[PDB]
Design an enzyme around this catalytic site. Structure first.
Site, mmCIF file in Angstrom:
data_model
loop_
_atom_site.group_PDB
_atom_site.id
_atom_site.type_symbol
_atom_site.label_atom_id
_atom_site.label_comp_id
_atom_site.label_asym_id
_atom_site.label_seq_id
_atom_site.Cartn_x
_atom_site.Cartn_y
_atom_site.Cartn_z
ATOM 1 N N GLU A 169 -43.600 49.312 -10.294
ATOM 2 C CA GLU A 169 -44.201 50.458 -9.626
ATOM 3 C C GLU A 169 -45.145 50.097 -8.501
ATOM 4 O O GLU A 169 -45.933 49.141 -8.673
ATOM 5 C CB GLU A 169 -44.548 51.680 -10.486
ATOM 6 C CG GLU A 169 -45.266 51.348 -11.798
ATOM 7 C CD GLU A 169 -46.268 52.468 -12.078
ATOM 8 O OE1 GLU A 169 -46.865 53.073 -11.230
ATOM 9 O OE2 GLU A 169 -46.454 52.654 -13.341
ATOM 10 N N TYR A 195 -51.516 46.771 -8.911
ATOM 11 C CA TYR A 195 -50.154 47.061 -8.440
ATOM 12 C C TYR A 195 -49.686 45.931 -7.562
ATOM 13 O O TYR A 195 -50.498 45.294 -6.899
ATOM 14 C CB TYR A 195 -50.015 48.329 -7.565
ATOM 15 C CG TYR A 195 -50.408 49.558 -8.268
ATOM 16 C CD1 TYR A 195 -49.566 50.226 -9.157
ATOM 17 C CD2 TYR A 195 -51.719 50.046 -8.103
ATOM 18 C CE1 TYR A 195 -49.973 51.359 -9.813
ATOM 19 C CE2 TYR A 195 -52.138 51.221 -8.734
ATOM 20 C CZ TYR A 195 -51.275 51.828 -9.613
ATOM 21 O OH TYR A 195 -51.726 52.945 -10.268
ATOM 22 N N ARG A 235 -45.365 57.313 -6.484
ATOM 23 C CA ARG A 235 -44.938 55.880 -6.602
ATOM 24 C C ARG A 235 -43.497 55.677 -6.180
ATOM 25 O O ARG A 235 -42.635 56.520 -6.369
ATOM 26 C CB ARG A 235 -45.044 55.412 -8.045
ATOM 27 C CG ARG A 235 -46.325 55.695 -8.796
ATOM 28 C CD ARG A 235 -47.418 54.652 -8.513
ATOM 29 N NE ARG A 235 -48.632 55.027 -9.277
ATOM 30 C CZ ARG A 235 -49.592 55.855 -8.878
ATOM 31 N NH1 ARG A 235 -49.571 56.378 -7.665
ATOM 32 N NH2 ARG A 235 -50.606 56.100 -9.714
ATOM 33 N N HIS A 295 -46.704 61.844 -10.593
ATOM 34 C CA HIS A 295 -47.427 62.377 -11.726
ATOM 35 C C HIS A 295 -47.614 63.877 -11.491
ATOM 36 O O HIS A 295 -47.940 64.629 -12.371
ATOM 37 C CB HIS A 295 -48.822 61.805 -11.867
ATOM 38 C CG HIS A 295 -48.913 60.446 -12.475
ATOM 39 N ND1 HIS A 295 -48.337 60.123 -13.684
ATOM 40 C CD2 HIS A 295 -49.560 59.347 -11.958
ATOM 41 C CE1 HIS A 295 -48.630 58.806 -13.888
ATOM 42 N NE2 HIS A 295 -49.337 58.350 -12.873
ATOM 43 N N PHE A 341 -44.309 61.108 -15.578
ATOM 44 C CA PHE A 341 -43.875 61.243 -14.206
ATOM 45 C C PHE A 341 -42.657 62.132 -14.178
ATOM 46 O O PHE A 341 -41.989 62.278 -15.208
ATOM 47 C CB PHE A 341 -43.359 59.945 -13.616
ATOM 48 C CG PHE A 341 -44.335 58.856 -13.389
ATOM 49 C CD1 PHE A 341 -45.053 58.739 -12.143
ATOM 50 C CD2 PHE A 341 -44.582 57.864 -14.371
ATOM 51 C CE1 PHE A 341 -45.947 57.702 -11.955
ATOM 52 C CE2 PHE A 341 -45.467 56.808 -14.148
ATOM 53 C CZ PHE A 341 -46.164 56.767 -12.915
ATOM 54 N N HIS A 355 -46.877 46.555 -10.704
ATOM 55 C CA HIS A 355 -46.762 46.193 -12.100
ATOM 56 C C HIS A 355 -45.519 46.787 -12.754
ATOM 57 O O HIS A 355 -44.907 47.704 -12.231
ATOM 58 C CB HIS A 355 -48.061 46.377 -12.898
ATOM 59 C CG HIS A 355 -48.544 47.784 -13.061
ATOM 60 N ND1 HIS A 355 -49.850 48.139 -12.779
ATOM 61 C CD2 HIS A 355 -47.887 48.864 -13.543
ATOM 62 C CE1 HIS A 355 -49.930 49.424 -13.015
ATOM 63 N NE2 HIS A 355 -48.793 49.912 -13.462
HETATM 64 N N1 LIG Z 1 -45.671 57.299 -17.546
HETATM 65 C C1 LIG Z 1 -45.327 55.974 -17.491
HETATM 66 N N2 LIG Z 1 -46.275 55.075 -17.357
HETATM 67 C C2 LIG Z 1 -45.805 53.820 -17.344
HETATM 68 C C3 LIG Z 1 -44.509 53.373 -17.485
HETATM 69 N N3 LIG Z 1 -44.399 51.983 -17.454
HETATM 70 C C4 LIG Z 1 -45.639 51.588 -17.306
HETATM 71 N N4 LIG Z 1 -46.553 52.655 -17.260
HETATM 72 C C5 LIG Z 1 -47.966 52.470 -16.958
HETATM 73 O O1 LIG Z 1 -48.723 53.265 -17.848
HETATM 74 C C6 LIG Z 1 -49.690 54.025 -17.059
HETATM 75 C C7 LIG Z 1 -50.002 55.308 -17.802
HETATM 76 O O2 LIG Z 1 -49.645 56.408 -16.930
HETATM 77 C C8 LIG Z 1 -48.913 54.335 -15.775
HETATM 78 O O3 LIG Z 1 -49.718 54.435 -14.627
HETATM 79 P P1 LIG Z 1 -49.953 54.732 -13.002
HETATM 80 O O4 LIG Z 1 -50.515 56.114 -12.876
HETATM 81 O O5 LIG Z 1 -50.921 53.648 -12.584
HETATM 82 O O6 LIG Z 1 -48.636 54.622 -12.310
HETATM 83 C C9 LIG Z 1 -48.074 53.084 -15.571
HETATM 84 O O7 LIG Z 1 -48.783 52.354 -14.607
HETATM 85 C C10 LIG Z 1 -43.488 54.344 -17.694
HETATM 86 O O8 LIG Z 1 -42.287 54.156 -17.813
HETATM 87 N N5 LIG Z 1 -44.031 55.663 -17.654
#
Ligand SMILES: Nc1nc2c(ncn2[C@@H]2O[C@H](CO)[C@@H](OP(=O)(O)O)[C@H]2O)c(=O)[nH]1
Ligand SMILES: [Ca+2]
Length: 104
Positions: A58, A38, A77, A92, A100, A40
């Site tokens: 994020e 992160y 986030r 989440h 999310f 990312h």
């Molecule tokens: N659900 C979701 N995941 C995303 C998105 N763009 C990138 N991702 C990456 O895909 C991973 C699968 O959930 C997410 O993880 P995170 O839990 O680390 O935030 C996120 O980091 C998006 O728009 N939605």
């Protein structure tokens, strides 16, 4: 009172600002933190109707109030863009799988 509520997690505006600033810096410097690297890109598969323009990034916000520095990033986030504008606060928690939902 909470400015943002993510599941049982209560956030104030200050918490959000503090987190955003941290993530943005890292983003400026071309650096990341944690095993999930992160901050990312955030693709917005969810289709949220953000008032700010893409691209999005994020960065985790912790219930403890500490700034993310590694290890579990928890479920919350903050989402910001290239201009350092706040797009929103998401979680989440109460979302199916790895999707999310917006914090309220
Ligand atoms: N659900 C979701 N995941 C995303 C998105 N763009 C990138 N991702 C990456 O895909 C991973 C699968 O959930 C997410 O993880 P995170 O839990 O680390 O935030 C996120 O980091 C998006 O728009 N939605
Ligand atoms: Ca706080």
């Amino acid at each position: 009172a909470c400015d943002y509520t993510c599941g049982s997690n209560c956030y104030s505006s200050s918490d959000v600002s503090t987190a955003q600033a941290a993530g943005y810096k890292l983003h400026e410097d071309g650096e990341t933190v944690g095993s999930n690297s992160y901050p990312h890109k955030y693709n917005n598969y969810e289709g949220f109707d953000f008032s700010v323009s893409s691209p999005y990034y994020e960065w985790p916000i912790l219930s403890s109030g500490d700034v993310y520095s590694g290890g579990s990033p928890g479920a919350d986030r903050v989402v910001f863009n290239e201009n350092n504008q706040l797009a929103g606060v998401i979680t989440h928690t109460g979302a199916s799988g790895n999707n999310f939902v917006e914090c309220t």
